[model samples]
Target: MTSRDGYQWTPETGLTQGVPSLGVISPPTNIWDVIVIGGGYCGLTATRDLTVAGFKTLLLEARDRIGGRSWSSNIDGYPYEMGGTWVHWHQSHVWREITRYKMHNALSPSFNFSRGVNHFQLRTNPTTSTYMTHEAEDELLRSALHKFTNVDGTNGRTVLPFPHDMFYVPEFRKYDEMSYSERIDQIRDELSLNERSSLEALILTCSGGTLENSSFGEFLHWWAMSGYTYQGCQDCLTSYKFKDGQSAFARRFWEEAAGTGRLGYVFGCPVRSVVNERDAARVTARDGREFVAKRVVCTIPLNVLSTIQFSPALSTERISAMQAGHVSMCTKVHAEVDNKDMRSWTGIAYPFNKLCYAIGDGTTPAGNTHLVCFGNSANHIQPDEDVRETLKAVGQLAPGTFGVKRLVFHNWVKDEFAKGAGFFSRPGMVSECLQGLREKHGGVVFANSDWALGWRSFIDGAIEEGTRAARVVLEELG
Candidate 1:
């Protein structure tokens, strides 16, 4: 109600109102014990931990709101997640935060893999939609996905025995050089028609990119993170979400830091440069404003890192890694449709040349079913311009079953600060770029979910990176 950050449109409400936000607050000081760049989950967590440790901290954000890539927007008293929605008890870091803040009561079931009827659309022929029992789809996914993940003949447990500890298995490095398509093709002879389509859809949806561009190692790591089982992976991924929205959870971190009286922040201020001098780190904003700190926790996204100038320039390896970037140019669209019967229904397709995956997220307060649809690339659909055309792509999943009443979305791919959705690694990203991306330079430390040790591209990974980077800055200051 206070600030505008995302896009929203409806035949009734029009395009005047967007998502509500807490808006920006001016910083009280230009000097600080530590300066954290970006106000996403990682930056917020870092600032909170630093302030709790009695260090005066300053956070600078490019957007007017907090929650960098993930946040929730309210519509008719229902929380609609604009980005980064799913969470589970298996996510150790996020679970701990939820427990500490007693936010578990707000948890809501995301989707059920075997609860209701589901539909499958062909990759080559999207209009040919077929209905199947949820149990049948579940069985197909379980069998096919197990075959997909069993790289070491042990369901990937041997190749990545310890997921959080990324380098625990030296043999896992070879998989990093290969793409997901390569691995899928290696076992193509063993897959059925629907199994192949579902698996391909899963890969595209999870990685936020095409199979040929996504890392095989990253897929293995995801499988390992979910307890090395297909059922575990499904539950860990699509189990629960916050009913109050991720913004509510993000607010808890911001409030904790603000209560300490040692926190300063200024939104709408994008840092243009970070100069790691001999003793202090100098951060200059795009508006010619500068702040000095003893240490800096840089939480800028991997894709946007190149926009900022680093003094004593970053290592060539790190620069190369940044240039390689990630391949997650995904487009997520939330639509209020007239069909409520598909509340528990899910749809799947392959190739994802356009809309590939969509599901009945939940019912709105107005009794309309909310459909969360995703395309593999940003160019696939432009819902903001012509929602009718976007609905056509969605129609491919269930022809004549969907009639969009309203729609809302955020184009993260076109967003300057984000440049993509979730973090999906390119081939060789793990072996060649991960270490360089995580390396610290002088008084500046880099941390982002995109390059986190575990649960990368998630809120849990954001917290992990933030906590570790904050501890690094704390030790240096002491």
Candidate 2:
């Protein structure tokens, strides 16, 4: 029940507890098989798989809560996944667990179809606005996506033949160095003002809320991973979500890990350093407490990895990747509306839009329906510091149609545990550091969605990275 959030439960809303904290661990004996840092999905997944396999494991979380990026509250008995919301069967590791637990019954009902509204602002003429139905938005944005990403005109076939493995096709690797703005410049003459606005809006909203904020490589990488099509990206990456709650989704594995009798759970303790021993690994928390194991899988997020000290220092490339930080400075929110527009659809705008994307979650009878909102760094919508500003920004998603009644959101970029939102590679690292950043360093293995081999920046990627880290630990033990 302990967490650094203001949300609490009422009869028809919220939850009685937060991401479950498994309590603190006493001084360690350095005898475990693996130590997993960062209690988000990636680390939790590693802890579960390792302990259930009969290996002694320990999980340390900087926050008091367990679900790091993935968190939720039971709003009117329905799962409100506040962050890291969507998932699908294409994600191997996540789907396997979903099938194992029979969580398919928990899929959100409104996730049935891609219905709703898309609002765009004509930047050149500030007074004018455009609204399109979900279908029209998809068609317009889909064509824009093709031109924005496929620089070679092969429908992304030449630039990204292997989406999952960025480096698989050596020749296409150069695309990593491309910048979104650079590509926009190349194709500016090929499109009308409306086409340019739509194209820039989708990518800009995605890559830190400004087209110049992210490199073209990250977008290209996303295109390739999404089956080289816009619809694939839309349906699989953003359409579906868990209905049982993200907290439960994560706690299920953590509890199973604990039941193995060999897993150590610690919370409210931040790791300060990870020392690589020739035969073992040692983890020192901020309080000077230490836990040692034969190997370690650090699911620590890249945006704040530099906060921890490495005994011998990480590789230049690894440290460079982390030091460069992630590009997504997004602010995500959840709120309730008091009008008729509270249906399952999304509203988005181009750069500088207060609220870039908003989708209706469901109705709460007493509280009407809930909607989720996403804003870029430019919005400066600080959740705790200025709840008023947060609501004001979110209202812009559907201005004046409905008023937000109960608003709740988390500003992750300002969140000490997170430091930032999604991970989009800087200009050249998509090709330069994708593999190097993930390579195991002796007894320490790196795992995080920031550098995932597939669906990076998503829950699926987190699971994929965690699963891969566990397999390596098991193999190394053998």
Candidate 3:
């Protein structure tokens, strides 16, 4: 119940806690069998697997607490998710872990517009607004979404038969070359103006990036994973979340790994360099502390990897990919409003307001409405600095109804460890950079949710990459 890590701001508290060190560590001199960098879900899973397999594994995390991009801030005993919130049974990797931890019964619904009690939408391409039933909105979106995702006339089934494997069909590479905007343009005539704008807003909201930067194949991959149905997509993307928050699930991994007595961890340790030496992989922390391991799983996010010096240098393709980066620099703001009846209420804004989408996240313990709003870009609003900006953005969704009580957010874009919200593939990134980025450079295996095969950018993808990376290291060094 102590504030070990995370940041949150409020008018009453005014940034009470910033990144404080957890000060947890093991003997620095113990040479490890494997060293995992960045204690996000990926790092946690990999560290757990390695330690449970009886390898002396060490996990280094930049932040005081774990869960990298996905952690909940405890605000007066109520867990408010700061990042990586949504998960569903459909996401196999994350679900498997959730079930294994015996937390499967703790599922809660997100109450987004897909199944919200009320719905509101705004578009600025030509300035259109609507207040409709969720059913009506679903009907409108499904038709347009179908046309948008039907590139191969088989709902991307022909190309992305296995959504978990990025390049299962190989032909999917061609779609990866096209930007989301380009594909939308190809079917421009097939959609109504509202449909076009709404689709664009959904894409921006879901991908956490603009249309031109996101790949069409990335959309296809998600669509394929969501069973190629709009309803399925809605279910997987926004319908479910852990009631106890992601931190609990993440802690389970940490505890299991630590229980094996082979896990050593250091919080507040930012890795500065990873050297692929002839005998072992050496990792140097920012404070100049060094750790050596037979294998190093560098789960550093793609955007921030450029800051870490890698020995022999990453491949040119990997370097270029890091330079380009995934454009998922979006903001998620939690707003507590005066209207308690706004439970399961929804809002959609596009090309006009600071917020791209929002959903009623049930009521707070105090019986006030709690809404989770998504901004298209991080630069759009600094809610932490000024709660008034958060009010304005949330008010734009309903204007009169959205009387803000408080605003809470973590500036992920400004976060040193995570340079973005989540990873979304950019144009040509899947075909050109994905494989190279995943390739192991000597004893260093780079695994992160950014390039995870199936659920890239989600907790499931992090687990998938982490689990795979641990197995790879185990096979080689066991």
Best by TM-score: 1
Candidate 3 to truth, TM: 0.93
lDDT of each: 0.81, 0.72, 0.80
Q: lDDT at 268 for candidate 2?
A: 77
How do these models rank on TM-score, best leading? 1, 3, 2
Clashing pairs in 3: none
Error of 2 at 215 (Å): 2.2
Which pairs of residues have clashing backbones in candidate 1?
none
Question: Across residues 9-85, which tens digit of lDDT does each residue of candidate 3 receive?
Answer: 55666654453222223332223899999888999999999988889988887866778888776554456788898
Give the Cα error of residue 183 in candidate 1, in Å: 1.1
lDDT-based ranking, best first?
A: 1, 3, 2
Taking the tens digit of each residue's C-alpha lDDT, what string does model 2 give over 314-426?
88888888888878887776777776345655666545556666667676657476777776654545565655566666666666667766665556777777888778777
Better of 2 and 3 by TM-score: 3
lDDT (C-alpha) at residue 139 in model 3: 90
> Which stretches of model 2 miss by more than 4 angstroms?
6-31, 109-126, 378-380
User: Could you list the CA RMSD of all candidates, in the order they appear?
Assistant: 2.3, 3.9, 3.0
